[PDB]
Design a protein around this motif. Structure first.
Motif, PDB file in Angstrom:
ATOM      1  N   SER A  47      48.980  48.443 -20.804  1.00  0.00           N
ATOM      2  CA  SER A  47      47.934  47.359 -21.071  1.00  0.00           C
ATOM      3  C   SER A  47      48.070  46.267 -21.350  1.00  0.00           C
ATOM      4  CB  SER A  47      46.766  48.128 -21.923  1.00  0.00           C
ATOM      5  OG  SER A  47      46.849  49.459 -22.100  1.00  0.00           O
ATOM      6  N   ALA A  61      43.238  45.671 -21.330  1.00  0.00           N
ATOM      7  CA  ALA A  61      42.554  46.683 -19.614  1.00  0.00           C
ATOM      8  C   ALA A  61      44.006  47.315 -19.462  1.00  0.00           C
ATOM      9  CB  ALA A  61      42.522  45.708 -18.927  1.00  0.00           C
ATOM     10  N   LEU A  62      43.834  48.530 -19.193  1.00  0.00           N
ATOM     11  CA  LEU A  62      44.719  49.888 -18.738  1.00  0.00           C
ATOM     12  C   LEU A  62      44.262  49.673 -18.026  1.00  0.00           C
ATOM     13  CD1 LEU A  62      42.904  53.095 -20.193  1.00  0.00           C
ATOM     14  CD2 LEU A  62      44.002  52.073 -21.093  1.00  0.00           C
ATOM     15  N   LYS A  65      45.477  51.665 -15.389  1.00  0.00           N
ATOM     16  CA  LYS A  65      44.914  52.312 -14.471  1.00  0.00           C
ATOM     17  C   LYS A  65      43.715  53.141 -14.784  1.00  0.00           C
ATOM     18  CE  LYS A  65      47.736  54.404 -12.175  1.00  0.00           C
ATOM     19  NZ  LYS A  65      48.660  54.929 -10.980  1.00  0.00           N
ATOM     20  N   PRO A  66      42.039  52.903 -14.088  1.00  0.00           N
ATOM     21  CA  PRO A  66      40.820  54.520 -14.998  1.00  0.00           C
ATOM     22  C   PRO A  66      41.921  55.273 -15.565  1.00  0.00           C
ATOM     23  CG  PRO A  66      40.322  53.655 -13.608  1.00  0.00           C
ATOM     24  CD  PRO A  66      41.403  53.505 -13.217  1.00  0.00           C
ATOM     25  N   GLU A  88      40.955  59.567 -17.201  1.00  0.00           N
ATOM     26  CA  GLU A  88      40.028  60.185 -16.485  1.00  0.00           C
ATOM     27  C   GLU A  88      39.928  60.899 -18.390  1.00  0.00           C
ATOM     28  OE1 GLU A  88      39.079  59.873 -12.724  1.00  0.00           O
ATOM     29  OE2 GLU A  88      39.389  61.569 -13.325  1.00  0.00           O
ATOM     30  N   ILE A 147      35.609  58.511 -18.032  1.00  0.00           N
ATOM     31  CA  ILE A 147      36.297  57.299 -17.994  1.00  0.00           C
ATOM     32  C   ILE A 147      36.485  56.215 -18.860  1.00  0.00           C
ATOM     33  CG2 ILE A 147      36.552  55.335 -16.025  1.00  0.00           C
ATOM     34  CD1 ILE A 147      36.819  58.738 -15.417  1.00  0.00           C
ATOM     35  N   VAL A 148      38.084  55.542 -19.141  1.00  0.00           N
ATOM     36  CA  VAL A 148      38.229  55.454 -19.984  1.00  0.00           C
ATOM     37  C   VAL A 148      39.034  53.872 -18.972  1.00  0.00           C
ATOM     38  CG1 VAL A 148      39.867  54.713 -22.243  1.00  0.00           C
ATOM     39  CG2 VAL A 148      38.855  56.905 -21.693  1.00  0.00           C
ATOM     40  N   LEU A 149      38.677  52.841 -19.442  1.00  0.00           N
ATOM     41  CA  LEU A 149      39.445  51.362 -18.758  1.00  0.00           C
ATOM     42  C   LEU A 149      40.169  50.447 -19.716  1.00  0.00           C
ATOM     43  CD1 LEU A 149      35.875  50.733 -16.726  1.00  0.00           C
ATOM     44  CD2 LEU A 149      38.324  51.141 -15.756  1.00  0.00           C
ATOM     45  N   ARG A 150      39.410  50.280 -21.353  1.00  0.00           N
ATOM     46  CA  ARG A 150      40.060  49.359 -22.125  1.00  0.00           C
ATOM     47  C   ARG A 150      40.616  50.026 -23.139  1.00  0.00           C
ATOM     48  NH1 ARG A 150      35.478  48.383 -22.138  1.00  0.00           N
ATOM     49  NH2 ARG A 150      35.127  47.457 -24.178  1.00  0.00           N
ATOM     50  N   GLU A 167      37.974  51.186 -25.735  1.00  0.00           N
ATOM     51  CA  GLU A 167      37.214  52.520 -25.682  1.00  0.00           C
ATOM     52  C   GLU A 167      38.078  53.494 -26.279  1.00  0.00           C
ATOM     53  OE1 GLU A 167      37.058  51.610 -21.339  1.00  0.00           O
ATOM     54  OE2 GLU A 167      34.848  52.066 -22.468  1.00  0.00           O
TER      55      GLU A 167
END
Ligand SMILES: *[C@@H]1O[C@H](CO)[C@@H](O)[C@H](O)[C@H]1NC(C)=O
Length: 261
Positions: free
Chosen positions: A217, A221-222, A224-225, A227, A237-240, A243
């Motif tokens: 990250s 921020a990851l 890519k997404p 799931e 859906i995890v993006l960061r 989260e």
């Protein structure tokens, strides 16, 4: 380092939470961490194994031996017939086998082998337990205590109850240490038996993906997404990092630097 003990026979939420904290702090590499989440050492660390002793309400015990690098159980021992009985998976061989054999049951004391005639993968254990999925095997403090009494000191026990004890012990000790969410599921249902929900199985299966994603990250921020699944089985859906970070207790070892904090 110290054998970590947990008494499932006289347990409280606070005692289980102390046990998780102790296990996470002994297992973690003291230097490694990404976004403030401790990381496990790789395979060439100073101490490669951890021993965890579990006690039932019957006062009988079983000791688990864990590989420090990924918290997988390699085998277990119980006091049997005035001997240290050691039980090792059928795919542990050579140098590991006899580090396991001799750390659970020292050479200088009587011992006897009782092999586990299968390996420790979740698909294997579910088939020996007679289930299509491990969400059909209930977890809980009383069940962990009762399963210890069914194996510890018993001349005979079935592969079905051993594979069910290992499904309960691996999820309540190793998966709970890797994931604060599974630890919080045990504390939430502390006084009852319960089935692992779909977020518990999904996290268990994606521990390696989650650990690589967090490590790579940038600024939280990851790459890519990611799931994953919610408690009810719907898509999440995890993006960061922030989260997923409340559910993670330990990172698998991932090579290279990462944002420490
Ligand atoms: C691990 O990371 C180090 C530091 O970046 C690097 O030098 C080394 O090549 C990596 N090892 C592997 C097996 O990729």
């Amino acid at each position: 380092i110290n054998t970590i003990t947990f008494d499932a026979g006289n347990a409280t939420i606070n005692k289980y939470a102390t046990f998780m904290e102790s296990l996470r702090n002994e297992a973690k590499d003291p230097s490694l961490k990404c976004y403030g989440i401790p990381m496990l050492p790789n395979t060439n660390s100073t101490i490669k194994y951890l021993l965890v002793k579990l006690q039932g309400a019957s006062l009988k015990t079983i000791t688990l031996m864990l590989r420090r690098n990924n918290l997988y159980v390699m085998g277990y021992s119980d006091p049997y017939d005035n001997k240290c009985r050691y039980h090792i998976f059928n795919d542990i061989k050579g140098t590991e086998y006899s580090d396991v054999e001799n750390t659970l049951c020292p050479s200088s004391n009587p011992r006897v082998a009782k092999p586990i005639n299968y390996n420790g993968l979740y698909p294997t254990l579910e088939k020996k337990a007679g289930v299509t999925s491990r969400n059909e095997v209930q977890l809980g403090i009383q069940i962990l205590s009762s399963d210890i009494g069914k194996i510890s000191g018993q001349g005979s026990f079935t592969e079905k109850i051993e594979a069910k004890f290992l499904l309960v012990a691996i999820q309540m000790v190793s998966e709970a240490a890797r994931f604060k969410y599974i630890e919080n599921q045990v504390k939430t249902n502390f006084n009852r038996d319960f089935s692992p929900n779909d977020k518990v199985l999904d996290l268990e299966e994606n521990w390696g993906k989650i650990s690589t994603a967090i490590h790579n990250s940038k600024n939280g921020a990851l790459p890519k997404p990611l799931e994953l699944k919610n408690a009810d089985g719907t898509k999440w859906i995890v993006l960061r990092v922030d989260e997923i970070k409340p559910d993670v207790g330990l990172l698998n070892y991932v090579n290279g630097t990462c944002q420490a904090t």
